């Protein structure tokens, strides 16, 4: 039942044909200064990198982010 | 800002653009010809002709 949506928001929900087409990949970014947003990583432990080499790591900015 | 993606469009498929009319758009030879620039020959007038 979608009756709660109108009570909480005052408008009917918008279902588009591809379910999930409008869903962002991130819930949202808190723009309070001083916070750090990390990329998708598997383990945040220490390892020694190779010198004189650029390490490239993906970062998905799913919504507008002021850094 | 007309950037709302939640509304339904009305264009589907393909359009007949100038790129799909390759066989129907010809090359034109207007008949005009680009001549070369001529020089000035004046020396013959300053010589005793016989």
Name the closest residue on chain A to residue B4, using Cα atoms.
A22
DSSP state of A64: -
For A13, the token pair is: 């929900």
Q: B2-14 burial by CB neighbour count: b if 16+ within 10 A, else e?
A: eeeeeeeeeeeee
What Å resolution does this PDB entry report?
A: 2.8
Residue A52, chain B, CB below 8 Å: the answer is no
Query: Chain B partners of A22 at a C-beta cutoff of 8 Å?
Result: 5-6
**Cα–Cα distance for residue pair A38/B33, rounded to 1 Å:** 67
Q: Cα dist. B46→A31, B20, B41, B49, B50 in Å?
A: 89, 64, 11, 9, 13
User: Helix, strand or coil for residue A21?
Assistant: coil
Kindly state whether A22 is in contact with chain B, defined as any CB-CB distance less than 8 angstroms.
yes
Beta strands in A1-67 (DSSP E): none
Q: How was this one solved?
A: cryo-EM
Put simply, the answer to whether B5 touches A14 (Cβ < 8 Å) is: no
CB within 8 A of B46, min separation 6: which ones? none
Instruction: From A31, A27, A24, select the one nearest A66 (Cα to Cα).
Output: A31
Question: How many other CB atoms are there within 10 angstroms of residue A5's CB atom?
Answer: 13
A13: nearest CA partner in chain B: B6
Whether the CB-CB separation of A5 and A13 falls below 8 Å is answered with yes
Cβ neighbors of B32 (< 8 A, separation 6 or more) are: none
Backbone angles phi, psi at B10, to 5 degrees: -125, 15
């Amino acid at each position: 039942s979608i009756a709660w949506y109108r009570e909480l928001y005052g408008t009917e929900p918008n279902f588009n044909y591809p379910n999930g087409v409008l869903v962002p990949n991130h819930p949202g970014y808190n723009q309070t200064p001083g916070g750090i947003y990390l990329p998708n990583v598997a383990a945040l432990s220490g390892a020694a990198i190779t010198a004189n080499r650029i390490h490239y790591v993906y970062f998905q900015v799913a919504q507008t982010f002021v850094t | 800002a007309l950037n709302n993606t939640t509304y339904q469009g009305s264009m589907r498929g393909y359009a007949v653009t100038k790129s799909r009319l390759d066989s129907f758009i010809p090359e034109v030879w207007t008949g005009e010809v680009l001549r070369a620039l001529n020089q000035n020959f004046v020396a013959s007038q300053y010589v005793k002709t016989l």
